[PDB]
């Protein structure tokens, strides 16, 4: 039968270990699970499998653009802030807004600035002007885990455009991840 513990009478100091799926009942109540869709939208793989805006850059010349990639404190991706460590594939969505040219894109977790001077070794997929690509950067991280908060939690992204004439433009960036491994959930964030 039902114990008084499952009826509401408990002790907060007896909750450890963390993660106790204890059932709560009353005479007219029972945990009822109802699913409205064929799958879950709470699973890390599904939720995060959907991109979210990151930042935009306007380029008037080929100069290279390197930006630290970090988890959002803004979109649905904020749900990541509930975790401390991450590891796994990283989907980067880049849009090249230009009239005539090409955009070199590359990703590295390496903090050294110089390693990115010769962009070709790193990757540098090519998005023709007016096209958008989605490259999935692997976990080539020199650190087993990525503190999820760091201003560079995610590796740096490189964008250099091979323009042809006076043409200029702007590069919008969106980020998403493939199968994410989060660990050791930390306390919920505050609001600004």
């Amino acid at each position: 039968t039902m114990s008084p513990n499952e009826l509401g009478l408990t002790s907060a100091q007896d909750d450890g270990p963390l993660g106790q799926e204890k059932p709560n009942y009353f005479l007219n109540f029972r945990s009822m699970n109802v699913d409205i869709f064929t799958v879950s939208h709470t699973k890390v793989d599904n939720l995060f499998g959907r991109a979210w805006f990151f930042m935009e850059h306007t380029f008037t010349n080929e100069g290279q653009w390197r930006v630290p990639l970090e988890f959002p404190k803004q979109g649905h991706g904020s749900l990541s802030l509930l975790f401390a460590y991450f590891t796994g594939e990283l989907n980067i969505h880049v849009l090249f807004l230009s009239e005539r040219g090409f955009l070199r894109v590359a990703h590295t977790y390496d903090t050294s600035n110089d390693r990115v001077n010769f962009l070709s070794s790193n990757g540098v997929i090519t998005v023709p002007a007016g096209e958008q690509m989605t490259l999935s950067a692997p976990y080539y991280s020199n650190k087993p885990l990525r503190t999820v908060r760091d201003n560079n939690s995610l590796g740096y992204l490189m964008c250099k455009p091979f323009l042809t004439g006076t043409s200029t433009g702007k590069i919008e960036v969106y980020l998403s991840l493939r199968c994410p491994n989060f660990f050791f959930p930390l306390p919920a964030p505050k609001v600004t």
Binding site: S3, S11, D15, G19
Partner: protein
């Protein structure tokens, strides 16, 4: 009977008058999460007694193996443990050619020499224990060019010998674990010495285990052109180590009577 009996009566009475809809009340009685118990925890030479314990906690689906499966440190897991038994340089000295037979080249206080400086692998632990019981493995090294010749006596002298050293006849020291090592023939001597004393344990930071010495069997015959600076080095390893008596940091404690 009572006060334990109530969940059943209420649960039952509710049960008896139940109609088509069912009972209109359920009652369950049991013991509180915070029961009258006592917990005891023991770590190395420690015991924590608590009479008001609480449910221990821990992270989600935790792994306490504590072993890095990637081996970011490619060392034997027991490296830190065995570290203090590691081979180390106990002494170095330059034999002077003029020295007569039977002269003492160099000596090392045993066993406190393994904690000779704070830079000794064993110095760390040796501090937190007053008693010691260990075995030794010495390797006295002496290098000399082929042109030169000579011989040194590497011998282990227990406290008994060290005490009455002058009363003993040199040339008979070959009765003790030694290595008459003829230069120009051997560059190193090996000596395996077990725990030797008249007491089960020796005070840490003491010379009671005796001391290893190096004498002049036959003085160095160094030709004219040949070099004249021969160095004698004493290396030591602990075949087996054992620190028992706990004590304050490096405080002289008397294990003896």
């Amino acid at each position: 009977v009572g006060n334990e009996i109530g969940g059943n009566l209420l649960t039952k009475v509710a049960d008896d008058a139940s109609n088509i809809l069912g009972p209109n009340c359920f009652a369950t009685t049991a013991e509180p999460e915070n029961k009258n118990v006592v917990q005891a925890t023991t770590t190395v030479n420690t015991t924590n007694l608590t009479q008001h314990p609480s449910a221990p906690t821990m992270p989600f689906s935790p792994d306490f193996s504590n072993v890095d499966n990637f081996h970011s440190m490619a060392y034997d897991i027991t490296t830190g443990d065995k570290n203090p038994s590691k081979l180390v340089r106990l002494e170095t000295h330059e034999w002077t050619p003029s020295w007569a037979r039977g002269y003492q080249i160099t000596h090392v206080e045993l066993p406190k020499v393994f904690w000779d400086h704070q830079d000794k692998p064993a110095y760390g632990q040796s501090r937190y224990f007053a008693a010691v019981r260990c075995g030794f493995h010495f390797q006295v090294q002496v290098n000399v060019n082929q042109g030169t010749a000579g011989s040194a006596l590497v011998v282990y002298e227990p406290k008994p010998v060290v005490t009455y050293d002058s009363k003993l006849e040199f040339g008979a020291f070959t009765n003790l674990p030694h290595v008459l090592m003829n230069l120009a023939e051997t560059t190193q001597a090996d000596l395996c010495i077990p725990y030797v004393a008249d007491t089960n344990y020796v005070k840490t930071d003491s010379s009671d285990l005796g001391q290893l010495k190096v004498y002049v069997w036959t003085p160095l015959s160094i030709p004219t052109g040949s070099a004249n600076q021969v160095d004698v080095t004493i290396l030591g390893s602990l075949l087996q180590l054992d620190f028992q008596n706990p004590r304050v940091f490096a405080q002289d404690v008397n294990i003896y009577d």
